[PDB]
């Protein structure tokens, strides 16, 4: 045998090494052919749905979801004990190749990596095809295919069309180095941006309390008041909450909602080249303000789905929705206005006029938290190559990288009906940021329900089916702001 | 000195469903008190709704002008219909402004008044950046949307430039 | 330390996150420190 089975976790100091081994099976895609694909192949009635590209016989390996590398215990042992983590070194191995014919033994499997990032990088878009979360499962390698420039369903002049080690006693391996990225924050701030003040002491700044003397004619006056503990809304502040792009509030109670379709028509979107795209998930904003937990922003969350759920028009219970409540300290709520500006000059003949900022780009002083990562969620994304970017961290969450983990392309060398089964052991190393807090009282952290139940969460049922009961998020620990 | 072979929104793999879901149907239809929240996979067949990591770059809308003198309005709007900034009570035309696609693809006759390979990562100069919900849709009133004419910077924006004074701060100092 | 390879996550200790008049293991408005509940040590699980 050309390799062994490695699954484990090694908790060492400030580092954690995770190793996952899975058995996989790779068929032939496109009958060893490359083929053009487009929207017209489906009929492509919507311009917003218009696309063009090619399907390839190649497969690829997507480990980009966290649940591949962390058992539910390890994710618990992690999130409760640490303020942050981030990958350092990647290591990948493809061993124990077996080739079949249709079933009898035989051939080579071609496999290679793109180190210079020349081929289209499709991993960071959160597609299915990930390694299975439960080590006993066997994951069929998903087909590779890509998209490029288009006009309607037709291609255009600039559109583009796109060496491998050959292998049954052979193996394939490489090592990969994560570039420096900041720790993905996993904590909730104890203080809210506007509560930073010392409640016991006055400010030396002033605010304007009275613009008139009383009731009557010709009452205009200027009266000022010390910004102080009794009135905390008016005090001067050095920093302001992060950017916002409003989402339509949706009531998770069916009755509260409007009795008409509003999915697309009332959705936020951004416009590119005449094609409108839903703004998803969008900038990081707290889902709901304290006191209402049942609402969620429309596309402002990552909506996963439960086991046995799939495809079209599933019920509400089926899909599981992530929660962004913790970032409510530094960030504006997703379905609420940023604030107010004045729309005019007050005259003696005209009252002041205000308006609701729906969206605000960056201003000096804006601080924010990025979107939390989930055990079921993606890990990294690929920063596009452009002239300039701002805060490259990806909008679904995770670590933005200009040079993220390379793709691993794979296909069978060709006909005879043929498929290849094999093994994969992938190893990522993570750096840990320890919890230094001096907080006196015990803090909220993940726990299983001790009460009796039919089944164990994160365990297989009587038919062997494995399921992950709820989205789990990193930020449980608390820092001072 | 180059152009992209991929649009910002098509970076997806066409052959694979995401594991992400969206809100497919607010209303069951044709009846009073008939509202149901159905969810659906984001996938290849519907490419507008999928979750995406990066959004196109900033915009400050330009007025539109066409080469054919008939398509244009029968009035002089050169100064009145111009996008400007106001500094010390003096109004200055915005020229050329930030980098934006000069026209939508397929339409070569229209050009920005003070303004095409950046079209993939950048909003067209004439077109609004997007929509924003302007209220809460809760039975009494249906959901509404506004039009965003200009959009500042947001985490996850990527953009192209066009093909430094002594100050406390500057962002993307590359000359306009 | 614990080398446990158990797959499903443990019972831990938590501070219930819900709006409350006071915080547990903190001081009330007169500064009287309070321990609201006894805390045992046994949460993590072992094999027999």
């Amino acid at each position, epitope marked *: 045998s050309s390799g062994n089975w490695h699954c484990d976790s090694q908790w060492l100091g400030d580092r954690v090494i995770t190793t996952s081994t899975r058995t996989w099976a790779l068929p032939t895609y496109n009958n060893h052919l490359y083929k053009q694909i487009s929207n017209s192949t489906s009929g492509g009635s919507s311009n917003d749905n218009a696309y063009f590209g090619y399907s390839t016989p190649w497969g690829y390996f997507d480990f980009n979801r966290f649940h591949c590398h962390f058992s539910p215990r390890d994710w618990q042992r992690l999130i409760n004990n640490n303020w942050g983590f981030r990958p350092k070194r990647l290591n990948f191995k493809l061993f124990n190749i077996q080739v079949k014919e249709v079933i009898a033994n035989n051939s080579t499997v071609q496999v290679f990596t793109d180190s210079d990032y020349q081929l289209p990088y499709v991993l960071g878009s959160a597609h299915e095809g990930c390694l299975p979360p439960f080590p006993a499962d066997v994951f069929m390698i998903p087909q590779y295919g890509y998209l490029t420039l288009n006009d309607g369903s037709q291609a255009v002049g600039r559109s583009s069309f796109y060496p491998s080690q050959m292998l049954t006693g052979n193996n394939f391996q490489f090592s990969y180095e994560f570039e420096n990225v900041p720790f993905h924050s996993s904590y909730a701030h104890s203080q809210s941006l506007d509560r930073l003040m010392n409640p016991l002491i006055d400010q030396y700044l002033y605010y304007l309390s009275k613009t008139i003397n009383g009731s009557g004619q010709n009452q205009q006056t200027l009266k000022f008041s010390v910004a102080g503990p009794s009135n905390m809304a008016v005090q001067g502040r050095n920093y302001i909450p992060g950017p916002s792009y409003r989402q339509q509030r949706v009531s998770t109670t*069916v*009755t509260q909602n409007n009795n008409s379709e509003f999915a697309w028509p009332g959705a936020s979107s951004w416009a590119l080249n005449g094609r409108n795209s839903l703004m998803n998930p969008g900038p990081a904003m707290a889902s709901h303000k304290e006191g209402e937990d049942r609402f969620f922003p429309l596309s402002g969350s990552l909506i996963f789905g439960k086991q046995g759920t799939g495809r079209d028009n599933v019920d509400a*219970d089926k899909v*599981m929705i992530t929660n962004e409540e913790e970032i409510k300290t530094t960030n504006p709520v997703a379905t609420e206005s940023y604030g107010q500006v004045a729309t005019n000059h007050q005259s003696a003949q005209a009252q002041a006029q205000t308006g609701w900022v729906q969206n605000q780009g960056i201003l000096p002083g804006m601080v924010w938290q990025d979107r939390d990562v989930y055990l079921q969620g993606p890990i990294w994304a690929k920063i596009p190559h452009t002239d300039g970017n701002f805060h490259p961290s990806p909008l679904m969450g995770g670590f933005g990288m200009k040079h993220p983990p390379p793709q691993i392309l794979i296909k069978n060398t060709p006909f005879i009906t043929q498929y290849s089964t094999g093994q994969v052991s992938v190893e990522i190393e993570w750096e840990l940021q320890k919890e230094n807090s001096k907080r006196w009282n015990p803090e909220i952290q993940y726990t299983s*329900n001790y009460y009796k*139940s039919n089944n164990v969460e994160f365990a297989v049922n009587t038919e062997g089916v494995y399921s992950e009961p709820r989205p789990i998020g990193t930020r449980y620990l608390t820092r001072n702001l | 000195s180059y152009a992209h072979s991929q649009s910002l929104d098509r970076l997806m793999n066409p052959l694979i469903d995401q594991y992400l879901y969206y809100l497919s149907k607010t209303i069951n239809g044709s*009846g009073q*008190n*008939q509202q149901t929240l159905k969810f659906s996979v984001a996938g290849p067949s519907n490419m507008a709704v999928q979750g995406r990591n990066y959004i196109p770059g900033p915009s400050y809308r330009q007025q539109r002008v066409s080469t054919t003198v008939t398509q244009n309005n029968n009035s002089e709007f050169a100064w009145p219909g111009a996008s400007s900034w106001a500094l010390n009570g003096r109004n200055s035309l915005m020229n050329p402004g930030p980098a934006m696609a000069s026209h939508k693809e397929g339409e070569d006759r229209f050009f920005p008044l003070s303004g095409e390979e950046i079209k993939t990562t950048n909003p067209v100069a004439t077109e609004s950046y997007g929509q924003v919900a302007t209220n809460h849709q809760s039975a009494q009133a249906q959901a509404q949307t506004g039009w965003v004419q200009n959009q500042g910077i947001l985490p996850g924006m990527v953009w192209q430039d066009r093909d430094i004074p002594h100050t406390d701060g500057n962002f993307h100092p590359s000359p306009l | 330390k614990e080398n446990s390879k158990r797959w499903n996550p443990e019972i831990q200790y938590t501070s*219930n996150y819900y709006k409350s008049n006071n915080v547990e293991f903190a001081v009330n408005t007169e500064g009287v420190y309070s321990e609201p509940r006894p805390i045992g040590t046994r949460y993590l699980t072992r094999n027999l």
Partner: antibody
Amino acid sequence: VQLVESGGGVVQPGRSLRLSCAASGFSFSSFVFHWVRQAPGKGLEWVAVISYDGSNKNYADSVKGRFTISRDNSKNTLFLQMNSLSADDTAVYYCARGAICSSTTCYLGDSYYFYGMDVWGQGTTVTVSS
Amino acid sequence: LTQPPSVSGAPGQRVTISCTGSRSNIGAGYDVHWYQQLPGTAPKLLIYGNSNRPSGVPDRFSGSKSGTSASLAITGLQTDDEADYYCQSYDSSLSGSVFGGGTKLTVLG
């Protein structure tokens, strides 16, 4: 919006009678339904809870296995058929529709926790006596 | 989930009803929904959620949640407010909801 009941009668101990709830004026599919039983002098007792499309049903302890629940979506009807009635079951039965959710778990949106029953039915008296 | 067998108050006053609860019941943070029924009539949801009054409900009817025990404070007692109140909450161990033991408010006028 209306929720009714039917099927009540005089059972006598030991025999079964189906208990059906027909409902119109609201989408049948988008709401989760409950049955709640009330003895004459005793507080409301929650008999059963069935999710939308009827995929998952979790009975109360007392009635477990001696009741069943069937929800037919097409005719907008809720059917609770019971079995092996004793004289402890003599009481009204209210057809309920769950909507409101215990706050923190609303995002998971399970079949259970929708114990909020905004509106519910007229009830029917099922009397088990010899 | 246990309620007082009887509560009694005079018109024009402040009446309070409180249902103490177990860890399996209210420790989890599960919302506590209050119901009222005029006698011999179908019960009506009163305070959906921890403290919210739905459309078509009097402002005076207000209730809250603290610790394991929710409370409901009616202000400006009216004759129409004499009826049975019921505290429900989900119980984790049971895995099904548990209503309270029932209460009859007595308007003393």
